[PDB]
Amino acid sequence: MDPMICLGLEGTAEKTGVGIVTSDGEVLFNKTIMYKPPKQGINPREAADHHAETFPKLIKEAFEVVDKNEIDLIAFSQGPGLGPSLRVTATVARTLSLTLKKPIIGVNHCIAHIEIGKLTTEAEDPLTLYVSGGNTQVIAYVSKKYRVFGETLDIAVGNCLDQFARYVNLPHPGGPYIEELARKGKKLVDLPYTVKGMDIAFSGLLTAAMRAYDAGERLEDICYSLQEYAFSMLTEITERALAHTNKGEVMLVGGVAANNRLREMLKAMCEGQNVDFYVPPKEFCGDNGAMIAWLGLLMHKNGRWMSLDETKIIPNYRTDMVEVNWIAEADIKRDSYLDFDVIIKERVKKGYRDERLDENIRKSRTAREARYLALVKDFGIPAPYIFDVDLDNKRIMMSYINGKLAKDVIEDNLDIAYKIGEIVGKLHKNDVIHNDLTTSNFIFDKDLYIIDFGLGKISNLDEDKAVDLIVFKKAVLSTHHEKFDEIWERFLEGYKSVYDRWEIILELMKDVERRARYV
Numbered sequence: 419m420d421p422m423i424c425l426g427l428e429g430t431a432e433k434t435g436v437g438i439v440t441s442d443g444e445v446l447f448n449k450t451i452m453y454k455p456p457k458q459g460i461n462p463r464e465a466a467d468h469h470a471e472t473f474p475k476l477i478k479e480a481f482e483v484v485d486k487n488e489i490d491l492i493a494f495s496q497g498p499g500l501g502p503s504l505r506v507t508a509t510v511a512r513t514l515s516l517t518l519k520k521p522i523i524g525v526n527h528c529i530a531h532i533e534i535g536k537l538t539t540e541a542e543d544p545l546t547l548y549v550s551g552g553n554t555q556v557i558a559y560v561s562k563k564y565r566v567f568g569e570t571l572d573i574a575v576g577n578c579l580d581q582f583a584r585y586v587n588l589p590h591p592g593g594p595y596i597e598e599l600a601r602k603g604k605k606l607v608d609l610p611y612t613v614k615g616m617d618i619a620f621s622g623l624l625t626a627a628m629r630a631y632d633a634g635e636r637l638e639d640i641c642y643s644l645q646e647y648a649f650s651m652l653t654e655i656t657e658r659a660l661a662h663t664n665k666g667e668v669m670l671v672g673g674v675a676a677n678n679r680l681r682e683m684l685k686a687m688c689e690g691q692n693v694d695f696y697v698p699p700k701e702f703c704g705d706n707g708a709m710i711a712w713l714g715l716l717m718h719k720n721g722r723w724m725s726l727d728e729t730k731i732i733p734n735y736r737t738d739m740v741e742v743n744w745i746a747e748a749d750i751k752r753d754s755y756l757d758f759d760v761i762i763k764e765r766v767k768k769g770y771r772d773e774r775l776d777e778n779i780r781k782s783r784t785a786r787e788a789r790y791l792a793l794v795k796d797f798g799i800p801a802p803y804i805f806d807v808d809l810d811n812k813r814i815m816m817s818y819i820n821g822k823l824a825k826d827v828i829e830d831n832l833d834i835a836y837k838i839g840e841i842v843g844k845l846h847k848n849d850v851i852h853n854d855l856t857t858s859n860f861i862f863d864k865d866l867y868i869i870d871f872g873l874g875k876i877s878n879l880d881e882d883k884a885v886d887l888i889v890f891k892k893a894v895l896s897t898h899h900e901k902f903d904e905i906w907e908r909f910l911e912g913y914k915s916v917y918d919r920w921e922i923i924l925e926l927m928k929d930v931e932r933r934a935r936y937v
């Protein structure tokens with residue numbers, strides 16, 4: 419009876435997975451079967467239907483390998499994920515607990531992906547990029563909790579690819595086909611690169627890929643481009659998260675981790691930053707039951723229970739919500755005369771990306787930034803003065819603001835959350851979207867100074883102003899959790915002072931934020 423053994427169910431998404439694991443970290447059993455969608459016409463089916471048909475076939479096999487009387491705990495994926503899939507998973511898990519007369523534990527699918535990462539790889543405290551069909555977020559364990567530092571703002575990357583494959587009439591799963599076509603591509607088609615803070619968005623990209631297809635661009639080139647852009651965007655936010663959580667290893671996780679290109683771009687990045695890079699073996703990388711079981715053990719082994727009424731599925735289970743109980747883009751230089759001071763900001767090259775992309779990202783952000791830092795004094799917003807610019811070398815000569823970063827003084831002086839709101843309000847009052855609102859991008863002296871503008875854009879759309887505010891919101895929630903409530907409240911106070919339409923877009927935030935799981 420030494421090794422306590424647990425049976426876990428995975429069913430958050432499109433994969434039916436059953437796992438048996440022992441508290442000693444031994445995987446006695448682990449098989450998963452995927453949903454194969456029927457024609458999207460009439461006579462519809464859903465993954466839930468697949469789970470209902472598949473779970474008991476898998477459980478039979480499991481009981482043929484180990485004695486059901488030997489299993490001591492049953493665990494299941496409580497969320498996040500598809501509601502109808504969660505419910506079949508839960509109902510099957512509950513039936514097992516009741517007839518085996520054994521305890522049951524609901525487990526967070528996301529932090530289960532990473533825990534078997536640690537168990538199954540030489541990682542121990544990684545910044546982990548989790549990508550799949552329904553999920554894409556950057557997670558790290560900080561301050562006693564698993565937290566999101568970067569996530570998609572709309573669809574997951576897996577879904578971006580899946581929809582594109584469908585559009586261009588590739589069979590399911592189309593991922594492998596896009597990855598092969600991309601290898602034969604050579605032109606880097608014009609597509610939108612969309613990073614905002616540490617988050618990203620794939621919708622515009624997907625659409626532009628579609629329009630490029632309609633315009634008669636070579637399928638191979640579109641595929642190559644789709645991948646380069648999406649994967650670069652994902653490598654960038656992981657890079658930013660890395661410099662932000664101060665971790666020394668990165669772990670890639672999820673079905674999309676199967677993509678070699680993504681794996682290699684991600685390894686280059688980690689090699690550049692001298693950090694370790696781990697990927698679990700295929701069978702623990704994509705959705706699987708073993709990870710559910712192992713995390714199940716972790717929490718129960720450390721003493722935590724669940725009444726059948728506590729086993730309600732949580733479609734939007736956030737990583738924050740889980741009680742844990744088992745544990746740079748720009749070189750800046752300062753030049754001085756005996757009284758005058760200048761700083762030069764160089765956007766250095768990123769080896770991991772296609773040099774063509776790298777050239778456009780560095781030049782355009784540099785040009786934008788220069789142009790925007792200038793334009794914004796017209797609105798009464800302190801910023802550095804722009805002395806000169808050298809776009810060939812990706813450099814800016816600007817004035818020097820002596821002071822601490824907002825990120826470093828905001829919690830012990832919440833007033834400066836107000837000033838940030840004032841200058842954002844002034845921004846949106848004037849149609850400028852600053853797509854990187856964080857507390858690392860303002861410097862506080864007497865007034866408050868804005869010091870980044872590389873992702874700027876002119877726009878009168880409310881969706882864009884709304885997203886602007888969510889990126890700020892989300893960033894505050896991850897890096898200033900101890901004081902989040904208050905900083906946002908005062909951020910809105912400042913915003914309200916200046917921009918009279920604040921209410922319209924604040925409400926618009928909600929409808930955009932509901933790019934979550936149904937129910």
Ligand SMILES: [Mg+2]
Binds near residue numbers: 672
């Ligand atoms: Mg998963």
